[PDB]
Design a protein around this ligand. Structure first.
Ligand SMILES: Nc1ncnc2c1ncn2[C@@H]1O[C@H](COP(=O)(O)OP(=O)(O)O)[C@@H](O)[C@H]1O
Lengths: 221, 228
């Protein structure tokens, strides 16, 4: 029955993925026809700003569908692949690359309260890229400075990212999380952190901009 | 700790599923952004250059996609809530309520549902919510398209249960029989048989559409029995 349960859980998941790859094939059915259509028009007639725009909007859609497949598969990679990991070990490189990128922009990143050997359970690549996006995003709004701080209590780690940028109005605070924001978006992070039983909140930064608060629970055996 | 390690994995996959629920509804919301840009692009090209077989085709493929995005946005809301648990279950317990609500809905429409061959205490292993909503959609369908009557029949052998749903409605042409199972497919949301086909194939069973002796469409669900 251990095998029976394993085989059952595999089929729950493979069927979810089948349904998704079948929706994407059905969305691509007219999309490929559209792309074949522009291709024939491009050869028959000339190239134009309009035809260029139609062709790039077609790619933009196919890319989104392609992200939907991958990001779905990755959420499975994330639930099945997980381990006990220390706060300082996990995000040290993240903060080091980020410190260098600020130095290049002429800006200054400061880790006032550094992470310690604090137990976390979960996908390391997921949590690595979670803070990485918040930190890349804080390098955008910020005029000159960014500040990262780590806190720990009996319940969990609290990561706080602050910028001296323009920030966000009280109304827009709750509505700062949706994808394809033009890192990628900020809803990837919300999903990623809620996947690890944590939460994310946006606030007024004492620096003048926006304060991003990531909370994750500590790992207890 | 033998089952404590299972709960933890189940809870993880539960959170994994609800995160894939969100991701889908968010992609679908974002898909109308480039589509409108594409439609304003063809519109300007129609104005600049002339009208052509190509431009006509691109414009109709854009509509076809828009429709799908709408269907995807509706079947983003009302997601398949609280699934993922497989268990041993008896056929009669499983679909009793399904057939009872369905018998009442027919009575309201002035139509008549008949369970000629009822389900028995037959062993099944799998997600109950998945199998309940599988037949539920097939009967939802058969209630809508039928003119006056619907017939449900259960059969069992050493290999498995065979559920047959028949309606006196218009039915489907020989060509569209397999096509009605595809996502967004409609003969004229189209995600009904898409979901049923997945739910059955998941339980290593099968679904087929045929000519009904009642005059409409015959839907055949075959599931295997659970052996201890
Ligand atoms: N009982 C039926 N009789 C005739 N046509 C049917 C029947 N059931 C389904 N169809 C056709 O197959 C299509 C696909 O079915 P389905 O996936 O369940 O979509 P929907 O959610 O609109 O019912 C329907 O839109 C309809 O054209």
């Amino acid at each position: 029955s251990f095998n029976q349960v394993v085989t059952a859980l595999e089929r729950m998941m493979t069927s979810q993925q089948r349904l998704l790859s079948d929706i994407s094939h059905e969305l691509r059915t007219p999309l490929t026809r559209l792309q074949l259509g522009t291709a024939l028009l491009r050869r028959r007639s000339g190239e134009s700003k309009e035809l260029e725009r139609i062709e790039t909007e077609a790619q933009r859609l196919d890319s989104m569908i392609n992200d939907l497949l991958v990001m779905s598969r990755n959420q499975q990679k994330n639930a099945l692949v997980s381990e006990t990991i220390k706060a300082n070990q996990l995000w040290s490189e993240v903060l080091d690359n980020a410190a260098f990128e600020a130095e290049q922009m002429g800006k200054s990143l400061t880790v006032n309260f550094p992470p310690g050997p604090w137990p976390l359970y979960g996908n390391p690549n997921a949590l690595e890229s979670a803070l990485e996006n918040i930190v890349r995003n804080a390098l955008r709004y910020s005029h000159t400075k960014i500040e990262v701080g780590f806190a720990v209590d009996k319940d969990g780690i609290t990561i706080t990212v602050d910028d001296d940028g323009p920030g966000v109005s009280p109304e827009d605070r709750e509505q700062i999380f949706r994808p394809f924001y033009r890192g990628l978006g900020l809803a990837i992070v919300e999903t990623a952190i809620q996947q690890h039983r944590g939460w994310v909140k946006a606030e007024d930064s004492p620096l003048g901009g926006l304060r991003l608060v990531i909370w994750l629970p500590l790992y207890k055996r």
